[PDB]
Design a protein around this ligand. Structure first.
Ligand code: SF4
Ligand code: SF4
Lengths: 225, 225
């Protein structure tokens, strides 16, 4: 299926079945999306919700986070694991306070220059909060695209990662980008799961190569040897 | 453990781990709580969220629901199953429009007189939306209380149902009732599950008889013969 059909199908799915109501999806701002995405990167949504709420209550703005002692941040993080994320979160908040006047930056380069924020997270922050036209490529999205398009290789190989970014760019619209990127993450989290994907529930099932061949276990490739 | 300790433990749990952010939990009103509770009674939360959102968008008030054609209600219900709920929902909305001026009633008798609303649902509507001091007793709550208190009998027997209502009354506080009743429903849905309850995650584990005896399978009793 052509890229414009992929987009349309994902957006139609999101409208009827998507996750739209989580706390970081209401009255979205760059700060809220960044905080949530950092929390979500290594933690499931159900675990994250109470931490996001406690963080937003304690730190309503990025300057509040910046000005807090690191030990208080780490205390509030306790139980999320992967504390390098918290150390970077705090440093990034301080960079936003120091370099950007306390206003979370709204341009890609400046977002991507923050500690703890890579190309995909920067694209997520600006597409979800502001509708800027950037694609994403987290683990979940890699799996959806690798299955749909039979990307056999290990995404730890630069050439393979680049192929996946190209595919993501190709399917990602400008109109509705906030909805499409959330939908792709939702699909990878809840439908196109690591094991035994729920293809009958997937809006891509009519063009996905893995579904056609029952070969989801091949994609993405795993690390060699 | 004494009833006041049961309450306190449930409320402390809810504060750190409870579900607080679902759409029917924000800017709560009697109408929103009633709609959500009817949807939730035979359908899981993940399935309900998009239907609740579509209903609230199409029917912002109970008079809007009342004045709509039944066939439109049933069309929007499609996929939730158990359509007697939808038929009663519509009749109840019409009763609220006709008898109560379009303002969802805020007193127990008038709520409990609505089609599709029993004693527990009426108590849920008024406790969650307004903080009125009523206990609840749905299937999930029956299971939590029957396990904690070793209620061996089948809740289809009046005497057993009455015992469970008495226990619910005993543990239900006035202060924080909205939080306690949501928490009890959350516990029964996610922790004290029908099979293999997650007792190590449960705030009642230090006084629950079933946990002490590893005897959760006995409670509540199942229907005889
Ligand atoms: S059809 Fe199946 S394998 Fe293909 S993207 Fe959807 S869930 Fe994944
Ligand atoms: S301790 Fe176990 S059996 Fe007892 S109420 Fe909690 S989850 Fe249920």
């Amino acid at each position: 299926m052509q890229a414009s059909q992929f987009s349309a199908q994902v957006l139609d799915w999101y409208d009827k079945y998507g996750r739209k109501t989580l706390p970081w999806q209401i009255d979205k701002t760059p700060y809220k999306v960044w905080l949530s995405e950092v929390m979500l990167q290594q933690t499931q949504v159900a675990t994250v919700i109470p931490y996001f709420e406690r963080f937003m209550a304690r730190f309503p703005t990025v300057t509040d986070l910046a000005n807090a002692p690191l030990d208080e941040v780490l205390h509030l993080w306790t139980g999320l694991g992967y504390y390098a994320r918290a150390r970077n979160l705090h440093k990034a908040a301080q960079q936003v306070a120091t370099l950007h006047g306390g206003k979370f930056p709204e341009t890609f380069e400046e977002v991507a220059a923050l500690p703890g924020v890579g190309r995909s997270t920067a694209g997520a922050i600006l597409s979800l909060s502001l509708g800027k036209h950037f694609p994403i490529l987290n683990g979940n999205v890699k799996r959806v695209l690798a299955r749909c398009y039979a990307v056999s290789g290990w995404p730890g190989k630069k050439e393979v990662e680049n192929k996946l970014w190209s595919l993501s760019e190709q399917v990602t619209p400008a109109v509705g980008v906030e909805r499409f990127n959330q939908a792709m993450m939702d699909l990878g989290a809840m439908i196109c799961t690591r094991s035994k994907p729920k293809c009958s529930l997937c809006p891509l099932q009519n063009g996905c190569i893995a579904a056609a061949n029952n070969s989801w276990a091949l994609y993405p490739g795993k690390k060699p040897k």
